[PDB]
Nucleic acid binder design. Structure first.
Ligand SMILES: CC[C@H]1CN2CCc3cc(OC)c(OC)cc3[C@@H]2C[C@@H]1C[C@H]1NCCc2cc(OC)c(OC)cc21
Ligand SMILES: [Mg+2]
Ligand SMILES: [Mg+2]
Ligand SMILES: [Mg+2]
Ligand SMILES: [Mg+2]
Ligand SMILES: [Mg+2]
Ligand SMILES: [Zn+2]
Lengths: 139, 96, 212
RNA sequence: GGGACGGGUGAAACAGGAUGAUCCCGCCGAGACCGCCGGCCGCGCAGGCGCCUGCCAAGACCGCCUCUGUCAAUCAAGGGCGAAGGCCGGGGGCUAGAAGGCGAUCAGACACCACCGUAUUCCCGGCCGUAAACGGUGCCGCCCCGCGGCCGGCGCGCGCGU
């Protein structure tokens, strides 16, 4: 990578990106984006590191994917990131999965500086009707 | 015979109440009969809160919390131990 | 099906992003973009969410939205676009036993903007009150809403974008809202939830020059 | 923008992806709905009732050295209102989803679980007149242990506190 293909270096401050974590109940996504959500620097998913469909959202897969993403973004010249953790939302579980904390700890122990942390799960001021019926999943 | 004086719900001075959906099975339940709990938790587990604070660049930063209201149906609360089956005399207790 | 492609980041370059002069720290960061094949037209009208605490290093629960309107001298110039609080603060405000008033009003500026402002408030319990709930009678609520409308209209009726930005940054409108409302009754919290821009004039160049 | 899976489950498999999906961001269109506050709070004859602003008529309660003077209670016949589903004639078409289709489980599964999906769910005019329409307790009226909580109105007392 030529230097003009990388962010300008300055001891005054370090380049800041934004990491989007999707902590779903069936998969996990780790997405690094610049300050405006239009330029993608690195994207990885937990399903690229497991062979069983049931372990896609597991913590181990999240850690491996986070390591790969760390390598990529460090190669591309990024040092610090903000965090935006989210769940399914949208009239759904509204609770984080088991891979989010794994990804955060991997980032912390991977030599990355952390900025702000916030919730980004979509919530309605009021909703449509969800699936299941009026008796629910009877099982 | 009648098991409870409240008929298993808190319905006074009204005929009908708006419904809500269970967060586990999506059953439709009356608002006055559903079991509700309010929880406050950190976004990050306390195990790695210190690590995150060490890594954080900001000075004077504070860990944000999560505020959620969980609503469960009768069947799911018993299954997940949110409430318990009590003795006849203990049923009158209203204190946690 | 599958095919390999070259690494796109061998043809990218970065730009700096700058903030209006109301704030001490004016370097938001940098943005990547692809070389002309035009960058100066593709990095335009991009929106950046910046925390107020980082802008003025009481501030960590508020953020601003800034939009690029001009590229000059290898830098992106931005102005006001919106204002919001954080989600955790909003969730923390609510409480069981008290009622809340949520008002909204549409306010036109002098530069040709129409703004929508959302105001929230909560009631509190008196220091020596026998009961434990903080509910109030209807007439008090109506008086609170009327006072909110009056104060908002009088404090932002005739304002410009720079003055409004300064007022929002330094919480003056919140100060008058709480001062006035407390004359009606106890008022635990009184702030502005957020500000939205609905329509603006197509050409804003002198405005941009003044802000920067 | 970026480049290989994504969806879903107890575990899987049908539908999606180099015609670039999932993911991030901005805009556009339509139609529902009214959250955390929200309650041994309240209103209504019952069924039922929760966005902003404005208009319209109404109602119970309290206070009173205001007015009339038995004008009252309950009721076959008769009249009116009446959840959801359903029907007739027009609009509208997003979610969900009877019927139908399909993947699993099973000895079998035309069911429970997954996916697609018509009527319906929404509005206008009109029929139908049923519910565990339950406080499973008809309406009016009198007396009646004690303790306590909440809502509305009024009066007394002081050291003036909702
Ligand atoms: C309604 C679908 C049934 C299909 N199978 C049969 C095989 C099977 C084997 C299991 O052992 C690992 C198993 O563990 C969860 C589930 C199944 C499902 C069972 C399904 C039957 C359903 N009704 C009876 C009890 C029951 C218990 C369940 O445990 C939560 C369950 O999971 C959804 C489904 C069922
Ligand atoms: Mg069961
Ligand atoms: Mg029995
Ligand atoms: Mg009822
Ligand atoms: Mg109907
Ligand atoms: Mg009966
Ligand atoms: Zn539940």
């Amino acid at each position: 990578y030529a230097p003009e293909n990388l962010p300008a270096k300055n001891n005054n401050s370090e380049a800041f990106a934004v990491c989007h974590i999707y902590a779903g109940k069936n998969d996990t996504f780790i997405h690094v984006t610049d300050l405006s959500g239009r330029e993608t620097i690195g994207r990885v998913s937990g399903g690229m590191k497991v062979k069983r469909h049931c372990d896609e959202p597991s913590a181990y897969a999240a850690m491996q994917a986070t390591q790969d993403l760390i390598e990529i973004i460090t190669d591309r010249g990024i040092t610090a990131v903000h965090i935006k953790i989210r769940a399914d939302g949208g009239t759904g579980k509204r609770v984080y999965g088991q891979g989010g904390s794994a990804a955060i700890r991997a980032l912390v122990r991977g030599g990355i500086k952390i900025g702000r942390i916030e919730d980004s799960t979509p919530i309605p001021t009021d909703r449509t009707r969800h699936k299941g019926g009026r008796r629910g999943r009877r099982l | 015979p009648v098991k409870r004086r409240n008929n298993g719900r808190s319905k006074y001075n009204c005929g009908h109440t708006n419904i809500v959906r269970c967060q586990n099975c999506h059953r439709c339940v009356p608002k006055d009969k559903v079991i509700k709990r309010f929880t406050i938790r950190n976004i990050v587990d306390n195990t790695i809160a210190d690590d995150v604070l060490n890594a954080c660049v900001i000075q004077g930063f504070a860990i944000p919390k999560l505020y959620n209201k969980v609503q469960y149906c009768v069947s799911c609360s018993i299954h997940n131990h949110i409430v318990r089956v009590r003795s006849r005399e203990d049923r009158k207790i209203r204190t946690p | 099906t599958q095919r390999k492609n070259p690494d796109p980041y061998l043809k990218k370059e970065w730009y700096p992003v700058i903030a209006p002069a109301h704030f001490k720290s004016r370097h938001i960061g940098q943005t990547p973009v692809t070389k002309t094949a035009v960058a100066t037209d593709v990095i335009n009208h991009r929106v950046y969410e910046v925390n107020l605490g980082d802008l003025n290093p009481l501030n960590g629960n508020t953020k601003f939205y800034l939009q690029t309107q001009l590229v000059s001298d290898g830098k992106c110039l931005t102005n006001f676009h919106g204002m919001d609080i954080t989600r955790h603060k909003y969730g923390s405000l609510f409480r069981k036993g008290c009622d809340c008033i949520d008002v909204f009003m549409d306010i036109p500026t002098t530069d040709g903007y129409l703004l929508r402002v959302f105001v929230i408030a909560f009631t509190d319990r008196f220091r020596f009150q026998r009961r434990k709930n903080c509910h109030v009678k209807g007439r008090v609520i109506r008086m609170m809403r009327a006072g909110i409308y009056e104060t908002l209209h009088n404090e932002l009726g005739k304002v410009s974008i720079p003055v409004l930005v300064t007022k929002l940054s330094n919480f003056e409108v919140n100060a008058k809202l709480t001062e006035a409302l407390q004359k009606i009754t106890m008022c635990r919290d009184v702030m502005i939830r957020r500000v939205k821009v609905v329509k603006r004039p197509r050409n804003t160049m002198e405005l941009l020059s003044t802000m920067h």
